[PDB]
């Protein structure tokens, strides 16, 4: 059967020399050089193990030529924080701020009672 040869001078099986077979219109198998596999962004929460959704998994310099819609999500922090943790932050912000008002009134009250 037909045996393949590299089409470039890099003769080693390094991470930047990976290939795939491809049958051409001339009816022969050649090597095509694959691009590296991209990664979707990781959440900014540093906790959720999964990657973000609604975003292209591409190499970092390819992000320059993509429109903005492909790189984010139509929501606060979209493309940077997962929805699950944005829910927790909205509550956490609101609930801690409420707690401040409560303590402020009690602290003011004891001052009045003092």
């Amino acid at each position: 059967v037909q045996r393949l040869t590299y089409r470039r001078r890099l003769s080693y099986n390094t991470a930047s020399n990976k290939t795939r077979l491809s049958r051409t219109p001339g009816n022969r198998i050649v090597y095509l050089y694959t691009k590296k596999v991209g990664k979707a962004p990781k959440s900014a929460c540093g906790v959720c193990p999964g990657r973000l959704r609604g975003v292209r998994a591409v190499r970092p310099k390819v992000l320059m030529r993509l429109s903005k819609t492909k790189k984010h999500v139509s929501r606060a922090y979209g493309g940077s924080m997962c929805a699950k943790c944005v829910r927790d932050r909205i509550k956490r912000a609101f609930l801690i701020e409420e707690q401040k008002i409560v303590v402020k009134v009690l602290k003011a009250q004891a001052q009045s009672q003092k």
């Binding site: 929501r75 929805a83 944005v86 909205i90 956490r92 409420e98």
Partner: protein
């Protein structure tokens, strides 16, 4: 007892408006055939009025006090009830669940809430409702 009633201020927890403040215009605790879950029609602030100081002119202040509103139907699980209640009278003949069929009615519904929100804002009542939540 039940507290999700009209005039109740809620924080939106999900969607394009996550983190915004809204006010319940109509609550449906049981649901319907279209929405089996419990939901509420809310009218909230997409874009809050900007901070104004005494160092700005009348014109700069007017420019900075405009509010962009929105009207939505929300699953209760995506709302965060708050103790604050805000009583702006929102015309229910224009702001109702039916505005979701044709965009022309929704524009009136959003325009209505824009005017009503802006008139209340200037009076200095319900200051919390018109301050963006920093989260």
């Amino acid at each position: 007892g039940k507290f999700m009633k009209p005039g109740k201020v809620v924080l939106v927890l999900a969607g394009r408006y996550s983190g915004r403040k809204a006010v319940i215009v109509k609550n449906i605790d049981d649901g319907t055939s279209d929405r089996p879950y419990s939901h509420a029609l809310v009218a909230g602030i997409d874009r809050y009025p900007r901070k104004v100081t005494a160092a700005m002119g009348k014109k700069k202040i007017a420019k900075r006090s405009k509010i962009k509103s929105f009207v939505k139907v929300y699953n209760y699980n995506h709302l965060m009830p708050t103790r604050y209640s805000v009583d702006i009278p929102l015309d229910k003949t224009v702001v109702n669940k039916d505005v979701f069929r044709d965009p022309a009615l929704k524009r009136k519904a959003r325009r209505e809430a824009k005017v009503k929100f802006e008139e209340r804002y200037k009076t200095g009542k319900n200051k919390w409702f018109f301050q963006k939540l920093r989260f």
